[PDB]
Structures are given as C-alpha cells and as structure tokens.
Amino acid sequence: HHHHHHMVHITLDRNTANSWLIISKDRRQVRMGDTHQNVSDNKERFSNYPMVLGAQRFSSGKMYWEVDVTQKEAWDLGVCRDSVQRKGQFSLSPENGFWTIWLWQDSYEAGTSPQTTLHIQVPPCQIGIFVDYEAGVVSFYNITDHGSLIYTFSECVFAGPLRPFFNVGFNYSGGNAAPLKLCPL
Ligand SMILES: O=C(C1CC1)N1CCN(c2ccc(F)cc2)CC1
C-alpha cells in the first residue's frame, strides 16, 4: 500500500476512556490499570469495556495511522461514529457504528455481523488503519508483513463524524497488560 502520505497525528481523549485505563502524558499510549484510576464518571466514558477514542474527528478526506499491539493477547482497533453507545453491553458492528478488527483467543476477526475470520500468516506487531471518508472505505494493513492487506470494509455508511477507536482488552489471564501505542510518523 502507498497510504503512508495521508498520515495523521492521533492522540487519545482521556474523557472517553474507561475509568481503569491509564493514558500516557503524551496521549499516545494506553494500558489497562490493575484498579479504578481515580477519575470522575461522565456520559462519554465507555462503562463495560476497556475502550477509549482518539480526540480527532474526521468528516472528509483520507487518513492513515499505525498502532503497536506487541505481546497483546486481545484488543479491538478501528474507527467508530462519534455518536456510538458508551454505556452497557453492545456488539462491534457497522450497524452499531463501528468498523473494527480484533484479536481474541489466538484468532483475528473483522467486526462484521456476524464476525468474519481473517487469514493472517504473520501475527502483526503493528497495524495500519486507512480511512477514505468519501469512498466509504476502512482498510487494515499488517506493517510487520510489508504492509500486506488484512481487511477492507467497503460501502461503509459512516452517517457522522468518525473517531479513532481502541480497546486494550481485559487482563484476566495476566498475559494482556501490554499497552496499545500510536506509532510515530
Ligand atoms: O505494568 C506496566 C508498568 C507499570 C509497570 N506495564 C507497562 C509495560 N508492559 C508491557 C508488557 C508487554 C509488552 F510487550 C510491552 C509492555 C506491561 C504493563
């Protein structure tokens, strides 16, 4: 892929974070804390899952960023509508306003309804995410495997401003403490 030139500098929005998340001072890294992080509750925070949004909102153009997933057992990545549900239980699907992939129990899947099996030969340490707003496209790239395509959502109905979307995953196993990191341009 030749999408690198649409690179955007993403930062995390503390106010949207689940109350157990720890965001770095530079707002470029997030990890699961071992307890509540001593913040007040608000209507923006994801309540049920270890999720956070990027601060940036996109309503036009082409955007590209990269995320480091090194040594994580579980995570979700992609984009979502600014108006997605924050409280209670929900599935990651385009009908609910999410365009995502994930790792879970040694398999990679795209957040369609129902979910789609991904075919990844080289487990990725860094994921590239490309959004073309006008074309209605969200694509995922394996940076570890020379930028090979993972998945393309096409005919997307965004129906609003988009925000970068992250889920660090739970850490029941003790094997999923590692952070998500936004990689430098
Ligand atoms: O607990 C902490 C620090 C407070 C001590 N962590 C940050 C670095 N962690 C990490 C794990 C795997 C890995 F591949 C990269 C980073 C583990 C979680």
UniProtKB/Swiss-Prot annotation:
Q: Does the keyword Phosphoprotein apply?
A: no
Modifications made to the protein after synthesis: Autoubiquitinated; does not lead to its proteasomal degradation. Deubiquitinated by USP4; leading to its stabilization. Autoubiquitinated.
Source organism superkingdom: Eukaryota
Induction (free text): Up-regulated by IFN.
Q: How does it assemble?
A: Homotrimer. Component of a SCF(SKP2)-like complex containing CUL1, SKP1, TRIM21 and SKP2. Interacts with CALR, CUL1, FBXW11, HSPA5, IKBKB, IRF3, SKP1 and VCP. Interacts with SKP2; the interaction with SKP2 does not depend on an intact F-box domain. Interacts (via N-terminus and C-terminus) with DCP2 (via N-terminus and C-terminus). Interacts (via C-terminus) with IRF8 (via C-terminus). Interacts with ULK1, BECN1 and with ATG8 family members, including GABARAP, GABARAPL1, GABARAPL2 and MAP1LC3C/LC3C. Interacts with TRIM21 and SQSTM1/sequestosome 1. Interacts with IRF3.
Role description: E3 ubiquitin-protein ligase whose activity is dependent on E2 enzymes, UBE2D1, UBE2D2, UBE2E1 and UBE2E2. Forms a ubiquitin ligase complex in cooperation with the E2 UBE2D2 that is used not only for the ubiquitination of USP4 and IKBKB but also for its self-ubiquitination. Component of cullin-RING-based SCF (SKP1-CUL1-F-box protein) E3 ubiquitin-protein ligase complexes such as SCF(SKP2)-like complexes. A TRIM21-containing SCF(SKP2)-like complex is shown to mediate ubiquitination of CDKN1B ('Thr-187' phosphorylated-form), thereby promoting its degradation by the proteasome.
Instruction: Please identify the protein, giving its name as recorded.
Output: E3 ubiquitin-protein ligase TRIM21
Instruction: Name the gene.
Output: Trim21
Shown residues in whole-protein numbering: 291 to 468 of 470
